[PDB]
């Protein structure tokens, strides 16, 4: 059950990273769009 919890914990962290990485990619692309 400790390993099970560790898998879903890892999953959750990966998801939180994915979300922010993607938000920040969109921000940077919006900035390149506006500046050009």
């Amino acid at each position: 059950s400790q390993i099970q919890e560790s898998l879903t914990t890892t999953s959750t962290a990966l998801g939180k990273l994915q979300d922010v990485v993607n938000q920040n990619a969109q921000a940077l692309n919006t900035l390149v769009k506006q500046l050009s």
């Binding site: 390993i3 099970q4 898998l7 879903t8 990966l14 994915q18 990485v21 990619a25 692309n29 500046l35």
Partner: protein
Amino acid sequence: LGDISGINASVVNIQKEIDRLNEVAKNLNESLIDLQELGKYEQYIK
């Protein structure tokens, strides 16, 4: 401003891996020696 319009940030997609980890977490008993695996052992050893 010139010289920058080609600059592009990529997006990541690890949804399949995220989902797979949650799937595997439910079925971890097939990887462990629990009481059901000992039952399979007991059948072997008789």
